Amino acid sequence: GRVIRNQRKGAGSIFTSHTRLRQGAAKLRTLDYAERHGYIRGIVKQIVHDSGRGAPLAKVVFRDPYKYRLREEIFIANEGVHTGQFIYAGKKASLNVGNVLPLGSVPEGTIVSNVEEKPGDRGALARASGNYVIIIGHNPDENKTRVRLPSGAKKVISSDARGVIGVIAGGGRVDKPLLKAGRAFHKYRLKRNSWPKTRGVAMNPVDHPHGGGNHQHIGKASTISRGAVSGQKAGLIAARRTGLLRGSQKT
RNA sequence: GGUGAACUAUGCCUGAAUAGGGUGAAGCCAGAGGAAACUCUGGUGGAGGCUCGUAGCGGUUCUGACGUGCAAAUCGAUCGUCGAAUUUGGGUAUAGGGGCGAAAGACUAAUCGAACCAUCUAGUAGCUGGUUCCUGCCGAAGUUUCCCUCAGGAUAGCAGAAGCUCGUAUCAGUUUUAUGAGGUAAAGCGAAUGAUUAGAGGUUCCGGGGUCGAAAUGACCUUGACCUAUUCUCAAACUUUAA
RNA sequence: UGGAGGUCAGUGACGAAGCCUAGACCGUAAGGUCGGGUCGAACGGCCUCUAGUGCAGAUCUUGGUGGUAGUAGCAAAUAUUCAAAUGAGAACUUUGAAGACUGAAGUGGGGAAAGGUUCCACGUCAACAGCAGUUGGACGUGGGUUAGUCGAUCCUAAGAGAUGGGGAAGCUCCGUUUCAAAGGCCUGAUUUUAUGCAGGCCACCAUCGAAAGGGAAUCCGGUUAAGAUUCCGGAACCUGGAUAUGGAUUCUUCACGGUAACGUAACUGAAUGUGGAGACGUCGGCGCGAGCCCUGGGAGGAGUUAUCUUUUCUUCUUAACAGCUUAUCACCCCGGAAUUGGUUUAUCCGGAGAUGGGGUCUUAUGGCUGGAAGAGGCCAGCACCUUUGCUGGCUCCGGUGCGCUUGUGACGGCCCGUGAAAAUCCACAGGAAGGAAUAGUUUUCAUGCCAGGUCGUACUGAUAACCGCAGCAGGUCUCCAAGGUGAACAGCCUCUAGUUGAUAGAAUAAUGUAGAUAAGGGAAGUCGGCAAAAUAGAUCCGUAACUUCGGGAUAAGGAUUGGCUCUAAGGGUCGGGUACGAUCAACUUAGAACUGGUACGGACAAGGGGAAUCUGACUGUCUAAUUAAAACAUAGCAUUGCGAUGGUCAGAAAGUGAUGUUGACGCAAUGUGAUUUCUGCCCAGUGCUCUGAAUGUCAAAGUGAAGAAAUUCAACCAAGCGCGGGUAAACGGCGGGAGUAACUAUGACUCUCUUAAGGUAGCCAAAUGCCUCGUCAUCUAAUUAGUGACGCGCAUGAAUGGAUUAACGAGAUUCCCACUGUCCCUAUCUACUAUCUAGCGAAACCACAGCCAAGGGAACGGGCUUGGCAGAAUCAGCGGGGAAAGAAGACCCUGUUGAGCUUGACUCUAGUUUGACAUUGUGAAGAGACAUAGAGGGCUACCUUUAUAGUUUCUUUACUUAUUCAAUGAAGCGGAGCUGGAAUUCAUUUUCCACGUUCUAGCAUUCAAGGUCCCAUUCGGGGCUGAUCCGGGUUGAAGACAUUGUCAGGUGGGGAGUUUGGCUGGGGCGGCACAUCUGUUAAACGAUAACGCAGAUGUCCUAAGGGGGGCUCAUGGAGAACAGAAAUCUCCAGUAGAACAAAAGGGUAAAAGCCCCCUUGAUUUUGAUUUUCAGUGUGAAUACAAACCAUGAAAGUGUGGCCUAUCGAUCCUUUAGUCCCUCGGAAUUUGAGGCUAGAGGUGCCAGAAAAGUUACCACAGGGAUAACUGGCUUGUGGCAGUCAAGCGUUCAUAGCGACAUUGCUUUUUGAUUCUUCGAUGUCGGCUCUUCCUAUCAUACCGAAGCAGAAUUCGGUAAGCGUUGGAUUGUUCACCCACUAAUAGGGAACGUGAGCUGGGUUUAGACCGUCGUGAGACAGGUUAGUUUUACCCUACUGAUGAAUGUUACCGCAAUAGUAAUUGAACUUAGUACGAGAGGAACAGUUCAUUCGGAUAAUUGGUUUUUGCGGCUGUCUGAUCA
């Protein structure tokens, strides 16, 4: 057999992301000195569409505390944020939509987004349109804070990790059917070359583990071990279960 | 170990190209009806991977032409599509068990179910083909045994050549005489084994039946449950005999 | 024969070698010698030496050359002609005259890529331009490409890529700002001075990458053989560069004005910061320009003028740049708006200030002027052979629009799509610095001065400049774009411009290719309506089922359409004493009358339609070059993994990467495949996943006995595996048998075995059903087709998706209407061919060749044999033959030849996972702790234990510096703390904070202002503090874990390599004839074959071996008390009819059988022999020798089994055999290695270690071997005969005919394997000829159970015919019909260079069944390139030399031959018939079918382009 399609993606030749029209890496500002003993005010000058991203981005201008210069930052726009608005970043920032409070400074049940995984990483969690993080609670001894992630996962991290109060804007995007192969075409041409997708069973055995046969059929179980090697990991990888999901999963 | 993305496949970057019709979406205007909810009518508007149809892009049928062609894929008519998942130039990226693939094992320079170039490499071939002067003498084999042996080998045989040891060759694909061995042909089955056609005595040792009703071994026949003399026809795996 | 040593003191320019020579001689021959000719420098004989030494073949190599053959051919792209000139030479060159075409998405005018000189000129024609050539993209010689402004250069884009550094043995790889000590300009200084020496801002990080992206700036006129936005003449602009004049400071230093938007000629402005431009998609309508189009007047020129619009055509132009002026939008000021107003085509805007009234700028765009009329263009006139001008005019006014194109503007629509970057330029904020006696600044005002290098610049850009081997009908990016028709860059015609190229000439036979027409019928043709035809535009009318409500729809269906003369409706522009008109203007509609050979979208252009089924939702995509599809995508649906020290993937590695400028509304991996309605049951199997009592398994390391050590273990032993659970929108799967309802039939019901579950909802002879052409209905005259419906469905079925489904489809299919040459049944026409000619001129192929019949032959001969015969040279055709050509068959088999693909094949492997050790740096805890110790259990060795020196726990931690991770321009860390807050201390500090910023789209920078002590407060300064001190750990996370290195287990078709027997009446399946044994085949020694026949073996036995002894067996006859057919018991008879392990055959009777006693000879040693045989091995073992034994009184017998079968090499391991030998510097004890004899096993049995598939396929071969024909055979098939039991009513034989039996045929199928695998094209049909007869019809006749008619049987007879259709690819079949009949066959199962291609039988795809899978299927289905004749022969026709010429009329050998059948009337309603019924011969009139002619008529055909009509355009109109 030959190298299969999912194997060829790691080379990154034609599968690198199409990044020409993007507005930059959407990041929180650097956790420098002001954000950790006070707050710093900034103004959102524009909210723009980022190609390949469902969520809008916010351009915010902070002042440099150490030099006479206007420092722009690329925040993910939370729902309700408008141009001409002040957003306050730091530990003493007020609990308002658009502010960049540390997780330890917010009460239980706070809806945050673009949350840091580690203090200073400038934001990792709940960044896609319509997503958010909830504050389940705090653990002041060994200063920590447990949060609820958009996938439903529970995660405990340091209370110094910052986030934007509110929910990412652009929510409800996947509620509209694309209705047309052409709409899926335009969606993925600004993202990466992952579309359209030929089924493995419609291939020949040289091209895919699913390929071949006098009928289109997988032939072997499509659930694949975690310890399988590349070229073998096609189908449902390390699947705990399969089939239509009935009932709940205690989520 | 090298060389190719000038074709083509796919991403990206930067540019360019696409008559005229049909249909008539939302939004909007004006009337009409209604208690209200709202409904109706006439316009306006110009939507759509809509539609007829050029350029373009494809390539359905004639299984038309041609089929040592205009052409290693073309020509003509007929066709699909024609504002978009559209067509396309240049730049750029991905390179051979690699790429790329809306997937045909397709495409990757007329090369693809693994490109091309050189070298290893005069690769190996129990297989096919060929194997170059004359005359003289001799002269076969397709058989034995073994072998992943069955289109091949080894071995023995058959053949050639070289000879070596004597002055009548202890021999012979022959006969005779003598003496053995043989189970074939034929023959045989009133001989064994096995088959096999017909008639010739008696006898209730279970059962088929009756003069008379168990009438006692009862004045009858029927497998013979106990009997010898015949008789027709046979044998590769029968035989006394026996060429 | 080449070369070498020796010799002939060989031949030779008075001629060596070579070559030619139906000249000679010699030799059987290979060859040698010589005559003659040609020839010019070397070469022979003999003795020897030596080798790259001898050709007919190798689809041999290289080269050369034939027949074919003056042949095929030189036919696409409408088309040429006349004359002259130039030339030997003109169909093709030039010039003129015509005729035509491209017809502005051109045959026009430019470019990009590419080419490279093809450009241009002059000479010139050997070759090239497939004819020609005087011509040329040819040949030879030259000339030609002129830039500050046009491009490159500059900039960045995807992306390439150094350095720092890190990998890599290394070529090199990563990496691109990363863990790097990566930086200019002003009066600083400004006289050893230009860095001798305190003058700031940083936080820049290479570079390459666009001749279509971004960019500084140029235009017009002229000019050349060729260059020009480059040269020239005018007229501009931009960039760089020093001062300088013109207007402003010394009485306000850095302008005024406008309430304001903002204006003007200027009108300082550093660091630092900020903003704008550069800079952006697409579509639609509207507006406005430019150019083009149209048009009026006038001023010129040309055309037409028998007649006729003041007519037709054409010129009448104005660049860059400068000034003034000119805008939708936007903004400002002023009354402050509901009766809401303004307003676009499009419906937006207004108290956030509308309407209204007043108000700036961007040469957007236009106008005027300069440029600039002097240019250019149009007329008229003079120059009259110095390669040259001069003169006079005109060049002026307008109008029009759904026009075309382009640009612009203001808008509106779309997106889960929102449509580069940088260079570069400016602006703003700011307030560092500087400015008073002729000065200072303004060089963003005007004017002035100088320079602007380098590389490219010709031409083509394509039916001849590029690529396709070429001057190739192919391919190759783009700009401009006239008139008419018309909706239209459709088609058609025309203008400007450009071409007129393409081998040609002759009347154009057959057959063709391309284009057409057709009486009557109308799909009867055919697999199939393939092909063609058929109302096609527009207007009006009218439009069904169904539907996802959007469609379907142009459904269907109908009417009209010309010309002319009229009518009606529809618009734009003004002076207001508080309803009025002349002007002017354009094509859209609608109507009427009239008119005509009822014609009119008149050419052109231009949908056939409908009723249904299968299938895929749709649009889209692919097998370039046989498959466009139902295949793939798709949206939708569902499932899976992953929260970043992550999932998926990459890399040799790396301080390395893609996803990722990412973050679950995400990325990654799969399946299904719109909507609707649904998606049932099964987790047993295979996976996948989740879990941890281990008297379960268990690797390295590590830990545990004793002399000496090398050397076995155990171990909540790591993971894994096992154990347990989950999971089917994972792979997948989803049953039988029997009975039963009061007529039968069926079975609601009922047991019974069984599965993980037994197929649910649905659906169906479906693209899935074998049987099967299912059954019923419908459709038809007739239907293997279609549709509807139906069942015990070979083998339907639910996201391996089920059912449905509007719309859509170059997709399967059926029917109907229309339509037709598809056909009945052909005919006719046109062009180009073919043909003939002049030139030019191939190829395939070719052992030799070319007439048959039979024969025999390798079983289908051109040759050979016997016959028929046979006469030059030939032309056009033609498709019978040459088993024609094209390719070392692609099918099949063989090979110890592959490859692609797959898997629980064998052997591994990247990766991954797990453990140990190592970079792994201190302590604590009941350290499984070493000797003396209770209990719980039907004094007794796992279970909280402690008293007696001493290094270790299950395993958690009081750490950080090693290592790891992440950010930052390493900006603020850890403490002490300075005024105060605090549920507040019981004695001045025992924690922590403001370190004093949250209405607002402002601002924040110049050692900082201030404050306190100091200075010649001389560009104004210094110190401290504002802004606390101390510690220099940049800051966090992480931590002796990870990571990394090594080793060790697991996993690992992701990957690699390899393998995947043999025989065989082809191979496969089957079997084993593969190692053996008995009988037979087997033919009386021995041997002897077949997948011959009948059987057997891989064992069994301490006795079933050995010895000895005793005794007779099977079976019948003869008795008995419950005793019998079978229990015994006793006599008889009994040649073995029993038994002896087994198969069979032999053998055995005081035994070889049966019973008893004793035993292990079934033992040692090693030789000889027999069988298979090579006289090898193996297996059996026959007879001895030397021992030891057993038994028996003894003779003797016994070296396994009464005999013939019952089995195993090398290497390795292991055992036994006196430590026998060796371990080689010498020893001792372990270990190892040797010698002899066994065992462990190879059954494919003289002995490899081994799974599939290929319909994607490959190679070497095979006719040693299958799939056709042919040949042998003829079982089977088919067709006859003999006999005659019987049938035929009482009769074998009219007609039949059993039981038997003899044949024939090769129109069946087997059997075989002879021919062919360096290929003989295969099914069927179509077409066409001939033959056979085993006669269906027609002629004559015989017979009958022939009384007539009709039949039946038979004879001679193949002369003559033997059909049209529905269904099916079909042969076959079947049905509907038709006259006389609808007989059977052959000819390579006749006939594919004759067709066709429906079927079969490549590659695509679907289904069902099967398979884990790749895949398979004599299962169904759909799509799937049909090549070449010009040769020989044959045939059909056509010429023709030659037996004196030439001409005419003849004969007639030989060959061919042709007519056929029916009906009606009459006979005759007769003969016959005691009825029905019902002939025949003679006669007459017609008609099947076939044949030969012919064209009077009728019909068909039309380039008679003959006449007429009609449309569009062009010739000005008319005529034409």
Curated annotation (Swiss-Prot):
Disulfide feature: none
GO cellular component: cytosol; cytosolic large ribosomal subunit
Xref: InterPro entries: NA-bd_OB-fold, Rib_uL2_dom2, Ribosomal_uL2, Ribosomal_uL2_C, Ribosomal_uL2_CS, Ribosomal_uL2_dom3, Ribosomal_uL2_RNA-bd_dom, Translation_prot_SH3-like_sf
GO BP term, pick one: maintenance of translational fidelity
Pfam families from the UniProt entry: Ribosomal_L2, Ribosomal_L2_C
GO molecular function: RNA binding; rRNA binding; structural constituent of ribosome
Signal peptide: none
UniProt key word DNA damage: no
Modification Phosphoserine, positions: 51, 94, 158-159, 248
Recorded family membership: Belongs to the universal ribosomal protein uL2 family.
Cross-link (Glycyl lysine isopeptide (Lys-Gly) (interchain with G-Cter in ubiquitin)): 45, 92, 118, 144
First-listed, main subcellular location of the protein, grouped into a coarse class: cytoplasm
Descriptive protein name: Large ribosomal subunit protein uL2A
Subcellular location: Cytoplasm
Coiled coil regions in record: none
Keyword Hydrolase: no
Domain of life: Eukaryota
SUPFAM superfamilies in the record: Nucleic acid-binding proteins, Translation proteins SH3-like domain
Alphabetized UniProt keyword annotations: Cytoplasm, Isopeptide bond, Phosphoprotein, Ribonucleoprotein, Ribosomal protein, RNA-binding, rRNA-binding, Ubl conjugation
Function: Component of the ribosome, a large ribonucleoprotein complex responsible for the synthesis of proteins in the cell. The small ribosomal subunit (SSU) binds messenger RNAs (mRNAs) and translates the encoded message by selecting cognate aminoacyl-transfer RNA (tRNA) molecules. The large subunit (LSU) contains the ribosomal catalytic site termed the peptidyl transferase center (PTC), which catalyzes the formation of peptide bonds, thereby polymerizing the amino acids delivered by tRNAs into a polypeptide chain.
Note: There are 2 genes for uL2 in yeast.
Subunit structure: Component of the large ribosomal subunit (LSU). Mature yeast ribosomes consist of a small (40S) and a large (60S) subunit. The 40S small subunit contains 1 molecule of ribosomal RNA (18S rRNA) and 33 different proteins (encoded by 57 genes). The large 60S subunit contains 3 rRNA molecules (25S, 5.8S and 5S rRNA) and 46 different proteins (encoded by 81 genes).
Lineage: Eukaryota, Fungi, Dikarya, Ascomycota, Saccharomycotina
